[PDB]
Amino acid sequence: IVGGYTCGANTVPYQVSLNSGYHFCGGSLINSQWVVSAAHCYKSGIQVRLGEDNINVVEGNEQFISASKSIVHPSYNSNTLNNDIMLIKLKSAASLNSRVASISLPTSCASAGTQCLISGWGNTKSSGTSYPDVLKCLKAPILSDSSCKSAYPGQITSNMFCAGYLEGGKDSCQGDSGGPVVCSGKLQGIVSWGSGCAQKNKPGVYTKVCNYVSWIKQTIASN
Ligand SMILES: [Ca+2]
C-alpha cells in the first residue's frame, strides 16, 4: 500500500497473509474454512496466516493453517487477468473471534463513488522498494467504469473495477495482491493489477467480487 496508514493490530480481522516460506499475497476470510484471493496468487504449499499484524513477529493472536485445496476460477485468463479470483480451503476451521473474523460477500455490486478500505503488506513506495512488517490500510473510492476504461484502454473487462485516485500517490501495490477491498462491510474487490503503483492516471484495478457470489457459494457448498 502506497500513501496509506498503519491500520492498527487486528483492526482488519478478515485480512489474511498467504505464506509459502514468506508472505507473497493477501486474502480475505469469508468463513471459518475458506479464503478468497486472486487467481494470480495461485501456487502449491500455501499456509494461511490469520490474526496477523507484524508478519515477521509472533504477537499472540495468529492462527497458522495449511491449505488443503485451492480452486482457481474456471475462466481465469492469466494474460488478461480476466476472472482473477481463487478460493483456498483451510485444512482445519479457523477459530473465529474479534481479531479473526469472516467478511460478508456482497448481495449487490458497489457503485462508483463508494468509499472502500484496501489493505495489505505490499510495497509502500511508488519508485523504491520498502515492505512494511505491519498491515497498511487505504481508504479509496470506486471509480466510474468510463474513467477506468479511459485510464486503461482495451484492458478493463466486466469483471474488473478501478479504485483509488487519478492524481496518483495513493494505491495498492506489489504484495497487496489477492487482498481485500471492503465497502460498507462487504467484500467488493480483490487486489488484482495496475501499471506500476500510485502513478498518475493509473489507478488500481480490482476483481469485481459481486460477479462471483454464485460461483463462490456453489463451490463452497460442494468442496
Ligand atoms: Ca505476526
UniProtKB/Swiss-Prot annotation:
GO cellular component: extracellular space; serine protease inhibitor complex
GO terms of molecular function: endopeptidase activity; metal ion binding; serine-type endopeptidase activity; serpin family protein binding
Positions annotated to bind Ca(2+): E52, N54, V57, E62
Amino-acid positions noted as binding substrate in the UniProt annotation, renumbered to this chain: D171, S172, Q174, G175, S177
Broad class of the protein's primary localization: secreted
Catalytic residues identified in the record: H40, D84, S177
Tissue: Synthesized in the acinar cells of the pancreas.
EC number of the protein: 3.4.21.4
PTM note: Subsequent cleavage after Lys-125 leads to alpha-trypsin. Further cleavage after Lys-170 yields pseudotrypsin. A cleavage may also occur after Arg-99.
Pfam families: Trypsin (PF00089)
Family affiliation: Belongs to the peptidase S1 family.
Activation and inhibition: Is inhibited by scorpion cyclotide trypsin inhibitor TopI1.
Protein name: Serine protease 1
Subunit and partners: Interacts with SERPINA1.
Keyword Hydrolase: yes
Named cofactor requirement(s): Ca(2+)
Annotated GO biological process: digestion; proteolysis
EC class (word): hydrolase
Domain Peptidase S1 residue range list: 1-221
Locations listed in the record: Secreted, Extracellular space
Record Gene3D superfamilies: Trypsin-like serine proteases (2.40.10.10)
Key words of the record: Calcium, Digestion, Disulfide bond, Hydrolase, Metal-binding, Protease, Secreted, Serine protease, Signal, Zymogen
Bridged cysteine pairs (disulfide): C7-C137, C25-C41, C109-C210, C116-C183, C148-C162, C173-C197
Coiled coil start-end: none
